[PDB]
Amino acid sequence: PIERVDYICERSVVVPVTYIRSNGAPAAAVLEVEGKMVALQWHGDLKKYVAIDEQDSYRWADRGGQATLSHLEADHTAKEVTLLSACRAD
Amino acid sequence: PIERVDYICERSVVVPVTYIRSNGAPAAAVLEVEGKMVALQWHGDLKKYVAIDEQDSYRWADRGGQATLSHLEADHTAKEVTLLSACRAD
Amino acid sequence: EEQPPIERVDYICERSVVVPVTYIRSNGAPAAAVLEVEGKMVALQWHGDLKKYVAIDEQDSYRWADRGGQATLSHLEAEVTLLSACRAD
Amino acid sequence: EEQPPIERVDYICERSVVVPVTYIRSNGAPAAAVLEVEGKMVALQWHGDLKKYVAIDEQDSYRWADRGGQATLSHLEAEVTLLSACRAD
């Protein structure tokens, strides 16, 4: 139910991740990115994790061994920005 | 079920924590300490969290608003060392 | 004994990213900067002709420029702007 | 233009704690060190009489000494050893 995975991304950036699963499904992920501890909740309909802090809305997708960090700024006019697109589990 | 709490400890050390609960009980905690991401599992009998990595066995107790970071070295002769004893939720 | 001026500055950037910086000056001129960015300690040397700091490691070539309190973090594999709205706190 | 030598050294300590260090030297002598410890960027000035580095912030007074490849991180509120088994990797 708790798993530590390190990802190596573009520019050799290392993203440490903790995954928390519950009863056969993803539940939460905790990341350390951009100097922050980022807690995210699994959204099954979106097939990705979304930050619990709506004012600092990182998203994390780990799919088929490739993971992506993105972020949506708080203002409703903002568009989602991809921050790391070449992360792979070490 | 997912909560971010920052602790301020001795020497003004800041320990970021994510708590993960499941069905009314503690389940996991993720800490950033000593430059590491540390994932810990709740042990109800011990009333504390214990690192999932037996080779780097941090322990975390958050009790009555006071939290304590300790660590047990891998060798069986080691004794538990208290690393931070004056942590309080910010 | 020599005491090059050492200054800590924290920058707050877009997404409220905090970039801690130590500046080390020597005899009235910039000399070095140390940043914590993307989970890394990055040491940089001042390049006066370029008017910016360049990572000492050519294999991980961050650049850092501060002009009028606004700073930019960029990176060159072999230049991409990583943070463009850093402001001295 | 002046180029004080800049060196990155990583120390591996007890509990496998990694302390990243940047050393900045000036004209053949130690001058400054920048550490990342306990989640902080800590800038320190060399004190030749004490043969160690002392934090520039007196309110958070870390000290760092490296002698023969073995280093100690300590701290003085107003001295506690925090890491005593650091070794240059």
- Given resolution (angstroms): 1.8
**Which chain C residues touch A7 with a CB distance below 8 Å?**
none
**CB pairs B-D closer than 8 Å:** 26
**Cβ separation of C45 and D20 shorter than 8 Å?**
no
Token duo for residue D34: 């920048």
Residues A41, B2 contacting (CB under 8 angstroms): yes
Structural domains of chain B ordered from first start: 2-89 (2.40.128.200)
**Which chain D residues touch C20 with a CB distance below 8 Å?**
41
Residue B14 touches chain A, beta carbons under 8 Å: no
Residues A28, A41 contacting (CB under 8 angstroms): yes
- Beta-bridged to residue A6, according to DSSP, are A16
**Which chain B residues touch D37 with a CB distance below 8 Å?**
35
- CA torsion, points C43, C48, C50, C51, in degrees to nearest 10? 80
**Which chain B residues touch D36 with a CB distance below 8 Å?**
35
What are the Cα distances from residue B86, in Å, to A32, B83, B89, C82, D20?
Answer: 24, 10, 10, 37, 26
Q: Whose structure tokens read 């009998």? A: B45
Question: To the nearest whole angstrom, how far is the Cα of B46 from the nearest Cα of chain D?
Answer: 22
Question: How far apart are the C-alpha atoms of A36 and B28, rounded to whole Å?
Answer: 19
Question: To the nearest whole angstrom, how far is the Cα of B63 from the nearest Cα of chain D?
Answer: 22
Burial of C38 (0-12, 13-18, 19+ CB in 10 A): buried
Residue A66 touches chain B, beta carbons under 8 Å: no
Radius of gyration of chain B (CA): 13
Residue B74 touches chain D, beta carbons under 8 Å: no
